[PDB]
Scaffold this active site. Structure first.
Site, PDB file in Angstrom:
ATOM      1  N   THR C   1       0.833  -1.195   0.000  1.00  0.00           N
ATOM      2  CA  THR C   1       0.000   0.000   0.000  1.00  0.00           C
ATOM      3  C   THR C   1       0.871   1.249   0.000  1.00  0.00           C
ATOM      4  OG1 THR C   1      -0.183   0.324   2.400  1.00  0.00           O
ATOM      5  CG2 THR C   1      -1.626  -1.311   1.384  1.00  0.00           C
ATOM      6  N   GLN C   2       1.128   1.786  -1.194  1.00  0.00           N
ATOM      7  CA  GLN C   2       2.000   2.947  -1.315  1.00  0.00           C
ATOM      8  C   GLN C   2       1.385   4.203  -0.713  1.00  0.00           C
ATOM      9  OE1 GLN C   2       4.861   1.861  -2.649  1.00  0.00           O
ATOM     10  NE2 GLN C   2       3.871  -0.091  -3.149  1.00  0.00           N
ATOM     11  N   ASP C  59      -4.814  -2.440   6.009  1.00  0.00           N
ATOM     12  CA  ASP C  59      -3.696  -3.362   6.173  1.00  0.00           C
ATOM     13  C   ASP C  59      -3.759  -4.061   7.522  1.00  0.00           C
ATOM     14  OD1 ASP C  59      -2.514  -2.989   3.680  1.00  0.00           O
ATOM     15  OD2 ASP C  59      -1.394  -1.229   4.358  1.00  0.00           O
ATOM     16  N   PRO C 105       4.342  -2.209   0.698  1.00  0.00           N
ATOM     17  CA  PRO C 105       4.393  -2.238   2.162  1.00  0.00           C
ATOM     18  C   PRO C 105       3.029  -2.457   2.792  1.00  0.00           C
ATOM     19  CG  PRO C 105       5.338  -0.204   1.246  1.00  0.00           C
ATOM     20  CD  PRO C 105       4.553  -0.855   0.171  1.00  0.00           C
TER      21      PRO C 105
END
Lengths: 146, 238, 213, 229, 243, 254, 237, 239, 227
Positions: C1-2, C59, C105
């Site tokens: 997840t940028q 996340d 990430p």
């Protein structure tokens, strides 16, 4: 089993089987003569011969289990000069799918193995050798296995 | 040379493994009948539960391919369930891809093509199940189709599958010779009495499954025990 | 997840003598746009391990589902083995290091609390993959203004009693609410001890604004 | 499998293709006659009961607005082959925005049959196809074989009594026929072998002329049958 | 039609290798499963082949999920493979849809896997038949049986292995639909002991479990005390029958 | 270990490839084809097995195909395998043209197709292409060329050759009465006509039973033309006249 | 028999897979090994065989990790491939989770792996049987893996040629097991191997390998002179 | 993706299919090869070349590079495959190392290819034997023989094909420094070896030669006839 | 039986053992290990006088400290030798040290049963890796079965049985490398099909010192004169 063929067939044996079928269960009841058949392959037999009324108690004889194999060993070793240290349970565990005679053959070949030297004993080494030589495993040089 | 796998053409044609698939379908042991009326399509099937230990609610050969399409399966039950899942997947994919409900004819064409691929290739076997699809088409009315393990998918006015397929077809043939314009009750009764006559059995409400689609209610409905009993009682009284 | 968009905030953790206590707000913020005010950012991984994240909540929920599935599989095994808090800590470190190295990430920073074999465990898995084991941890923006108190108290007294840890975490959360723009006056405290994990619902710290006037 | 199941016999013949030919010859009769202004593909569509709705599975299928196709052999193989022919025609149109020539379509369907003869785990198609088309300003009738070989025909028959049908066509066929007359000839050839009364539903016919290929409706087939009785 | 591949149909339309897989299935000791009114109880006649193994050394009762437990019969290798397949099916279902897999759906998926293996000749049918059992508050107590052919059928009481018919008669001699799990456990122990053939197998252990409301829809091995009580009930039943 | 494999690409107890040779004899059963080289051009005659009366004439040829500007081939054996092989030949020639900006030499194209043939005879379990090719072409290296390739993947360059039915008799006749540094196209056509006559004795060489294709050079371009029915009839009539004259001379001598 | 024993995907009419049986036979022909467990220890004792008397006896005890070892019987190459698999799985477990891999789960992984090439056509069972002796938080563990992919959790076990005599000895002395020191445990294992041995031969340092694991004792392999102390106390038959 | 074991051991430890490949070799036309002081000669039996067959397209002798040549015996299609692959490998070697290939290197490559085909899945062996004759950069004649099984040896004189055995025994005899002093004498030896099996000389013979690092040169039929004629003169002088 | 991975009823891969049968058809190689080094002497079967004896390469150099004597099928031998050399060089590159003979032998053997349906059949070659490493000279024998074992003295090939019986009769642990070469050549001459002439045998030696060395014609002639 009977079959349909346009060129040739086993018609005479089929006719004899049909006579046997009628004798077992046909027009004239014969309730005083009992019949026990025996076979190794019922997948071959004709359906009309296995039907109830002709052969109704279709007993199936199994491969002897461990205890059965030990008992067969003892039955065929009762008449020999048996040593008092024989782990028949060990022999049964080693047999591993010895079916019928195979156990009697184990006993007989153990006796033969004793007879080579000449003695009154089996000591569960003659029976071990008999099991080895009744397994009929073809000779190999697989001693390179781990 | 090889009548052991499909791709051999025993030397007059005669795809023996496909014929054996049909024999397996018969060997399934059950019978199913399908009829279509002026506005309704019905599928009855014998229901056997020889244990009293079986749930008897999971023993069903009537499946819902989609909300508007039903099916009755005959033959090997595992193959039946596999083909039913394939039919459901194909119907859902058609709805997702084209935006409208898959027609019954197109669904049977899909499953028949899959079965044809099985017969064309040697690795597979032609799975031995007979599918009978039921639905209401927007213009053709109560479509009733039947797909077989060879890839044949002809549409029928009234058909049957199973051990008594020939006798059921003959009985439905006799009935459809005359006055095929059947109402909902008439067609349900035709199917039920066809099965009963062919099986020489007086049907309790228990040992039959009935699935219906009507123009007024184009939703595949599996009739309950009470409704089946009502139809059977009416049949007996008449 | 940028891109982290809906994120939690600071998560505290302290080591009681016979257990661990972690604390986390119940706020899901969108960068000064608190939307989800009742989300729980602390989960009970197993009977002796607990997790608390201070990053992207999507996340965190994905980690929750995968970790729960893994512990479920272990219980299915039924072989008398339970993932230690240290084992969970190492698994999280490895997973997030792998995500970092592939440049996808998991934008989270999780405190691991646990209590297995008479030993309390406290770890700081985080986004890039750096892991630790400290008497006190503070993931997120709350490190700068909560770790001081925990560290000084622990250094003047390494072993904390139950009420000491409880009210220390209470004070740290109070100061976090005072001086954190993305805090919320309602949080959860999860305590793991020899009797398992217990989450103490939606606590709300009292304030003191006498200095306002 | 990846190993071909069609291999040369010690006599240098592909027995698998020969057996596919036998399966074709055991199929329903079909006739194709190309007239001076069009082509006609007729076929026997006899069902085994009136239960069979003879309006769902069509024996003669269109592949383009100027190409149609009938078969003799296995129905499922015919279905897959007609689907493949339609896809090939669409690919040809997309590449060249022009309806696929009949010769090219038969060439590509024949290539498909050949690659199913050569490939590993598959079976030769048990159908023989009778493509008809009106590309350019000429009529084309092609027979494609399970072997993957395509022959251009003035008129031919394939099915049960295909040798008798071919003899009948040789006797009755002339280059000067006209479409409505070739339809008569085709239905008469089918009657030459038909076993029973030829109803307008148990038979199917499709014409192909300047307007394009179209499967004649049962009403038109009924009118032709009445004129031929 | 030979019987050397699952892709070959017999002249009778009967795939013979699947039947041979079933033949392998009805050689394992035995496994009964009874669906009570508020749970499902599994029992297995785990034959201790040698005294060298530990009790529970060949567990034929696996936890396919929190709420699903399977009892297997046949080849243990194939049974373990199917247990792993069912475990991953349940895990995938929970991860994709977010709630515990219904037992009917899980049984259907695993049965379709078994059918996938019984279709082709590049593989062979599974040599094990298994029973799945679960309890949920919103779906009741469910018991399914899947065989090498991939036939998933629901049951109130089912038996697989050697003495499946004897176990079936013993189970039919019960009012399963109206009993409680705490008593169906004793009944299952009794059935195992009755169908066990002492002279044929001698050494014997009973492996029980249930999933029910008393377990909050969770599959667990029977507690030691409950298992011992059920075993004592079976022993006293056998003694009474002998007397 | 398969029971259905059939082991297409194995050797035999003797080093003899059964599938390849069964394909060879399938070629032998197939229709006859022959080719003749000549200083002015090359020609290729071919018997026709499509002599049915109801069979339409839609293509410019049935046994003979064009590979590129200055090259044609003729197929004997299986028609579908021949079609795929001709498509691959066209692809190879056009790939060479795209790559080098000049027509592929005849030997190079023959070698490429024969490489494909050998690949099918050695790799995989697929049966070989039961097709024999006769290539006639022109290139700036050796001018007019004639090649003959077999299912095994073996090709040879010939001045005159024959494949298919009675090919052995046809090649024996050509060996007997072919002249090396002579025999321009006129005599080559006459020789092909007489060879086809004595090879198809069953039928007296009806002009509709054979197809002849002639490749020549004109003004730097290569022309491949299929002889029309008129020209074939003229050639057959000339051969019949010559044969009658020879018979009359022999009888008069006797 | 002859048509049902060429492939692992062929079921015999009796519901048996003859290829699995043949792989088990290969394990049986492998040399003799005995594993046996106590309250806080697990011991493998293997009777190594010399192919030629100039050749060194083939080693049979292999490390898998600091807490796991295996005694192999059967095809040495397959044994080595399985050993590599166990080593890789243990390393992966110690990498992901900073902990030793439980033996109960390592054996399950081996079972799944060895079962995979038993359903598929053209693949064969791993012709090697294993006695896995390990120690985890739940004490010692002895497992028996076979080519059929069915693994047993054994209090004691014996595999290889003439292993049934060791099985009888272990059956006799299970009661003595579980309550004896490590020295007595190793003596029991050596006694089982001696029982497997023919009456003509006897155990010796060149002939015996001893893997030992237990609480506060990483798996250690003793061979050559390292085995002599365990044989000194051993008595005569 | 055929993936079938074509070549497998027989119960007695033989690879019967590479043996069958060797039989395919033995049923091919004879090819003789000799190496002298400063020339390597390589003859082959034309094996019934028809009057109508262009002899250019039959190439039982092919130059793999400027310093290496290959005589064939076996299946011509496999000949072409192996020769083309060897040529590609030789150019690749010239690329990687700025030196021409060595005859030993090319022979090793051919042998490696043959072994790969003899123990790869779904591939039958190359039913061919090859004679690689050439010169290295140091200027040394070299002759190698490679069998279908991937075994390659360095010889002083080979003959592979139908008359392999007879020609090999003939070369074993009457092969000596005196007989290979001169290039003409070496060509005489090769032509006599060929004549020992080919019933009619000249017509059924094709010679290629390689002098020291100059080029490959195919002797024309007139030159072959001249050599045969003076061989006949020498024979009749002896008798 | 059908398939390369089928087990015999006795427990037997059928293909490993047909490979053993193939080994029994090869030339006779004899390897000895002694405290002073390892000797490898292999019969070089010359079928014709026209065969260059120097081109029969049955003794090869795996590395500067390991040699390999091959018997059976020399092309499969060559494939295995190439793999062994690549593995030794890879180990040196990664670890900056030398492969132990045991390590290289096991790395090569792990490639012996990697066939199925990659290789389609086992390697029908038996190898003798004679090397010198940290723990002194070591001779390892590998067979198509992939089972490697280090022997004090081994004899593979057609004359394996008689050669190894003679190796028993002669070999003793406390011998010198010179006498090991002496005895190896005596045994090889005894089992030789023709006369031992110093051009129909390959001899090689690996010592704790000088690298793997293949005896030249002069040294071979000296030793053969000595015998």
């Amino acid at each position: 089993k009977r079959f349909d063929s346009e060129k040739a067939g086993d018609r005479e044996v089929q006719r004899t089987m049909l006579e046997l079928l009628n004798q077992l269960d046909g027009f004239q009841p014969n309730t005083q003569v009992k019949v026990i058949a025996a076979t190794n392959r019922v997948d071959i037999l004709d359906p009309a011969l296995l039907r109830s009324g002709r052969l109704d108690r279709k007993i199936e004889f199994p491969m002897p289990n461990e205890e059965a194999r030990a008992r067969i060993m003892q039955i065929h070793s009762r008449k020999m000069n048996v040593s008092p240290d024989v782990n028949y349970e060990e022999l049964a565990r080693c047999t591993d799918d010895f079916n019928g005679a195979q156990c009697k053959a184990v006993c007989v070949e153990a006796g033969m193995i004793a007879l080579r030297r000449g003695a009154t004993e089996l000591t569960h080494e003659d029976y071990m050798e008999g099991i080895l030589e009744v397994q009929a495993k073809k000779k190999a040089n697989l001693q390179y296995y781990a | 040379g090889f009548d052991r796998h499909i791709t051999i053409f025993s030397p007059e044609g005669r795809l023996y493994q496909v014929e054996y698939a049909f024999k397996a379908i018969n060997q399934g042991g059950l019978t199913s009948v399908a009829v279509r009326g002026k506005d309704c399509a019905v599928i009855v099937t014998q229901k056997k539960v020889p244990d009293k230990l079986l749930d008897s609610s999971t023993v069903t050969h009537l499946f819902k391919i989609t909300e508007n399409i039903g099916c009755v399966m005959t033959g090997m039950t595992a193959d039946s369930r596999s083909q039913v899942q394939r039919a459901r997947y194909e119907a859902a994919n058609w709805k997702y891809k084209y935006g409208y409900e898959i027609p019954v004819d197109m669904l049977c064409k899909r499953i028949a093509d899959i079965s044809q691929v099985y017969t064309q290739n040697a690795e597979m076997r032609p799975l031995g199940c007979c599918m009978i699809l039921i639905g209401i088409d927007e213009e053709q009315g109560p479509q009733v189709y039947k797909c077989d393990p060879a890839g044949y998918y002809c549409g029928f006015k009234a058909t049957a599958a199973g051990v008594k397929q020939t006798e059921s077809t003959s009985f439905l043939e006799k009935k459809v010779k005359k006055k095929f314009d059947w109402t909902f009750e008439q067609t349900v009764e035709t199917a039920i009495t066809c099965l009963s006559t062919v099986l020489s059995i007086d049907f309790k409400p228990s040992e039959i499954e009935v699935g219906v689609v009507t123009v007024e209610n184009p939703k595949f409905r599996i009739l309950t025990e009470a409704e089946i009993d009502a139809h059977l009682v009416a049949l007996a009284e008449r | 997840t940028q891109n982290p968009m809906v994120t939690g905030t600071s998560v505290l953790g302290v080591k009681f003598e016979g257990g661990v206590v972690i604390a986390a707000d119940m706020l899901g913020s969108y960068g000064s746009l608190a939307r989800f005010r009742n989300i729980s950012r602390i989960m009970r991984v197993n009977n002796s391990t607990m997790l608390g994240a201070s990053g992207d909540y999507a996340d965190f929920q994905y980690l929750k589902q995968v970790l729960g599935q893994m512990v479920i599989d272990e219980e299915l095994l039924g072989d008398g083995h339970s993932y230690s808090p240290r084992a969970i800590h190492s698994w999280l470190t490895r997973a997030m290091y792998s995500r970092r190295s592939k440049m996808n990430p998991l934008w989270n920073t999780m405190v691991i609390g646990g209590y297995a074999d008479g030993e309390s465990f406290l770890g700081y898995v985080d986004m890039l993959g750096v892991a630790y084991e400290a008497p006190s941890l503070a993931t997120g923006y709350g490190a700068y203004l909560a770790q001081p108190l925990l560290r000084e108290v622990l250094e003047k007294q390494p072993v904390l009693s139950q009420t000491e840890a409880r009210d220390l975490v209470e004070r740290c959360m109070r100061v976090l609410y005072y001086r954190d723009a993305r805090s919320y006056n309602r949080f959860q405290i999860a305590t793991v001890t020899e009797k398992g994990v217990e989450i103490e619902g939606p606590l709300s710290t009292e304030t003191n604004w006498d200095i306002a006037h | 499998y990846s190993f071909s199941l069609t291999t040369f016999s010690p006599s240098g013949k592909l027995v698998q293709i020969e057996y596919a030919l036998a399966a074709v010859a055991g199929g329903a009769p079909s006739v194709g006659i190309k007239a001076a202004n069009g082509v006609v593909l007729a076929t026997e569509k006899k069902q085994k009961s009136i239960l069979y709705d003879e309006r769902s599975v069509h024996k003669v299928e269109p592949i383009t607005k100027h190409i149609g196709l009938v078969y003799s052999g296995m129905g499922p193989d015919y279905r897959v082959l007609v689907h493949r022919a339609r896809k090939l025609a669409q690919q040809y149109y997309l590449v060249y925005q022009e309806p696929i020539p009949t010769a090219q379509l038969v060439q590509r369907v024949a290539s498909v049959m050949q690659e199913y003869t050569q490939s590993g785990g598959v079976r030769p198609f048990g159908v023989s196809l009778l493509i008809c088309g009106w590309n350019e300003g000429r009529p084309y009738l092609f027979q494609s074989d399970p072997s993957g070989a395509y022959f251009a025909w003035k008129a031919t028959a394939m099915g049960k009594n295909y040798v008798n049908g071919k003899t009948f066509l040789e006797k009755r066929y002339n280059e000067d026929l006209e479409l409505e007359d070739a339809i008569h000839t085709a239905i008469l050839t089918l009657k030459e072998s038909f076993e029973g009364q030829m109803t307008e539903d148990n038979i199917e016919v499709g014409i192909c002329n300047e307007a394009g290929f179209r499967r004649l409706t049962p009403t038109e087939v009924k009118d032709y049958l009445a004129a031929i009785a | 039609g030979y019987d050397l591949s699952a892709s070959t149909f017999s002249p009778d339309g009967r795939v013979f290798q699947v039947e041979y897989a079933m033949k392998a299935v009805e050689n394992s000791s035995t496994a009964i499963g009874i669906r009570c009114k508020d749970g499902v109880v599994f029992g297995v006649e785990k034959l201790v082949l040698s005294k060298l193994y530990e009790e529970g050394s060949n567990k034929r009762l696996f936890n396919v999920d929190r709420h699903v437990g399977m009892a297997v019969a046949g080849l243990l290798a194939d049974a373990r493979s199917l247990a792993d397949i069912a475990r991953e099916e349940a895990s995938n279902f929970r991860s994709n849809f977010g709630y515990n897999i219904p037992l009917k759906h899980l049984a259907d998926r695993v049965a379709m896997y078994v059918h996938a293996y019984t279709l082709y000749s590049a593989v062979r049918p599974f040599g094990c038949s298994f029973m799945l059992g679960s309890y949920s508050v919103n779906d009741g107590a469910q018991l399914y049986m899947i065989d090498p052919s991939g036939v998933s059928y629901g049951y109130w009481g089912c038996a697989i292995g050697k003495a499946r018919q004897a176990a079936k008669t013993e189970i039919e001699k019960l009012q399963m639909k109206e009993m409680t799990c705490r008593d169906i456990v004793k009944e299952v122990a009794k059935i195992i002991y009755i169908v066990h053939d002492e002279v044929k197998d001698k050494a014997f252990e009973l492996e029980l479990s249930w999933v029910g409301e008393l377990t909050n829809g969770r599959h667990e091995i029977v507690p030691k005390d409950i298992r011992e009580e059920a075993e004592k009930y079976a022993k006293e039943s056998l003694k009474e029958e002998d007397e | 270990s398969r029971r259905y494999d059939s082991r297409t690409t194995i050797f035999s107890p003797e080093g003899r490839l059964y599938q390849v040779e069964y394909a060879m004899e399938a070629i032998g059963h197939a229709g006859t084809c022959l080719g003749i080289l000549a200083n002015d051009g090359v020609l290729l005659a071919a018997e026709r097995r499509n002599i049915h009366k109801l069979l339409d004439e839609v293509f410019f040829s049935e046994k003979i195909y064009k590979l590129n500007e200055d090259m044609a081939c003729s197929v004997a054996g299986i028609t579908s395998d021949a079609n795929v092989l001709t498509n691959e030949l066209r692809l190879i020639a056009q790939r060479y043209l795209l790559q080098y900006q000049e027509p592929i030499p005849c030997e190079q194209l023959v070698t490429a197709l024969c490489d494909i043939k050998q690949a099918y005879t050695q790799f995989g379990g697929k049966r070989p292409f039961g097709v024999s090719l006769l290539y006639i072409g022109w290139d700036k290296h050796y001018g007019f060329q004639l090649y003959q390739s077999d299912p095994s993947g073996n090709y040879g360059g010939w001045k005159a050759t024959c494949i298919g039915n009675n090919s052995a008799a046809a090649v024996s006749m050509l060996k007997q009465d072919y002249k090396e540094g002579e025999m321009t196209l006129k005599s080559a056509l006459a020789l092909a006509i007489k060879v086809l006559n004595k090879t198809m004795d069953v039928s007296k060489l009806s002009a509709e039973k054979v197809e002849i294709a002639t490749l020549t050079r004109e003004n730097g371009k290569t022309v491949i033309r299929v002889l029309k029915q008129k020209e074939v009839e003229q050639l057959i009539k000339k051969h019949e006249e010559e044969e009658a004259k020879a018979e009359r001379e022999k009888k008069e001598k006797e | 028999r002859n048509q049902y024993d060429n492939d692992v995907t062929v079921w015999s009419p009796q519901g048996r897979i003859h290829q699995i049986e043949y792989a088990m036979e290969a394990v049986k022909q492998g040399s003799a090994t005995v594993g046996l467990k106590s309250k806080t220890h697990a011991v493998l004792v293997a009777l190594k065989r010399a192919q030629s008397e100039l050749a060194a006896h083939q080693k049979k005890i292999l490390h898998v990790d600091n807490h796991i070892g295996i005694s192999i019987a059967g095809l040495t190459a397959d044994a080595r491939l399985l050993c590599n698999f166990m080593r890789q799985e243990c390393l992966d477990s110690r990498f992901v989770f900073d902990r030793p891999l439980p033996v109960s789960r390592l054996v399950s992984l081996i079972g799944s792996k060895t079962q995979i090439p038993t359903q598929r056509y053209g693949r064969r069972p791993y012709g090697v049987g294993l006695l896995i002796a390990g120690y985890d938080d739940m004490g010692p563990h002895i497992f028996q893996t076979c080519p059929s992919a069915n693994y047993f959790d054994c209090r004691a076990m014996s595999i290889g040629a003439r292993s049934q005599s060791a099985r009888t000895y272990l059956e006799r002395h299970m009661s003595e097991f579980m309550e004896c020191n490590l020295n007595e445990l190793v003596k029991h294992g050596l006694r089982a191997l001696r029982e497997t041995l023919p009456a003509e031969q006897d155990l010796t340092t060149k002939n015996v390998s001893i893997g030992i694991v237990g609480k506060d004792l990483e798996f250690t392999i003793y061979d050559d002179d390292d085995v002599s102390p365990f044989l000194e106390g051993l008595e005569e038959r | 993706s055929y993936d079938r074991a074509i070549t497998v051991f027989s119960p007695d430890g033989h690879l019967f299919q590479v043996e069958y490949a060797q039989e395919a070799v033995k049923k091919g036309s004879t090819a003789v090869g000799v190496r002298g002081r400063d020339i390597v000669v390589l003859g082959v039996e034309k094996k019934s070349v028809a009057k109508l067959q262009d002899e250019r397209t039959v190439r039982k002798i092919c130059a793999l590079d400027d310093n290496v040549c290959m005589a064939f015996a076996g299946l011509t299609a496999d000949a072409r495959i192996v020769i083309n692959r060897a040529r590609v490998e030789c150019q690749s070697h010239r690329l990687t190392v700025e030196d021409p290939v060595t005859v030993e290197y090319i022979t090793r490559y051919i042998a490696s290819l043959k072994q790969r085909y003899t123990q790869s899945n779904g591939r039958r062996p190359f039913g061919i034997s090859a004679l690689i004759v050439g010169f290295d950069f140091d200027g040394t004649p070299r002759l190698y023989q490679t069998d279908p099984s991937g075994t390659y040896h360095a010889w002083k004189a080979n003959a592979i094909g139908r008359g392999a055995k007879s020609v090999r025994e003939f070369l074993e005899k009457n092969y000596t420094d005196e007989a290979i002093e001169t290039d003409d004498l070496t060509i005489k030896l090769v032509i006599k070896a060929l004549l020992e099996v080919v019933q009619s000389g000249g017509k059924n013979i094709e010679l290629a030669v390689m002098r020291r690092d100059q080029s490959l040169k195919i002797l024309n039929p007139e030159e072959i006839e001249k050599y045969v004629a003076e061989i006949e003169k020498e024979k009749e002088e002896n008798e | 039986d059908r398939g390369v991975n089928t087990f015999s009823p006795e427990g037997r891969l059928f293909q490993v053992e047909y490979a053993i049968e193939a080994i029994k058809l090869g030339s006779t190689a004899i390897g000895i290990q002694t405290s002073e080094g390892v000797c490898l002497a292999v019969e070089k079967r010359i079928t014709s006088p026209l065969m260059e004896p120097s081109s029969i390469e049955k003794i090869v150099e795996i590395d500067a400290h390991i040699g390999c004597a091959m018997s059976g099928l020399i092309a499969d031998a060559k494939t295995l030798i190439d793999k062994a050399r690549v593995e030794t060089q890879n180990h040196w590159f990664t670890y900056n040290e030398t492969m132990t003979v045991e390590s290289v032998t096991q790395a090569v053997s792990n490639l012996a049963l990697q066939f199925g349906e990659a290789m389609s059949r086992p390697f029908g070659v038996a190898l003798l890796f004679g090397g010198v490493d940290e723990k002194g000279p070591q001779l390892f024998h590998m067979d198509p079965s992939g089972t490697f074992v280090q022997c004090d003295a081994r004899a593979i090939g057609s004359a394996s049985e008689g050669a190894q019986s003679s190796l028993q009769e002669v070999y003793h642990k406390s011998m010198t490398l010179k006498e090991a070469i002496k005895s190896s050549l005596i045994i090889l001459k005894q089992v030789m099909e023709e006369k031992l002439n110093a051009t129909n045998i390959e001899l090689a030696t690996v010592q704790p010192g000088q690298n793997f060395h293949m005896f030249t014609k002069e040294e071979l002639e000296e030793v053969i004169k000595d015998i």
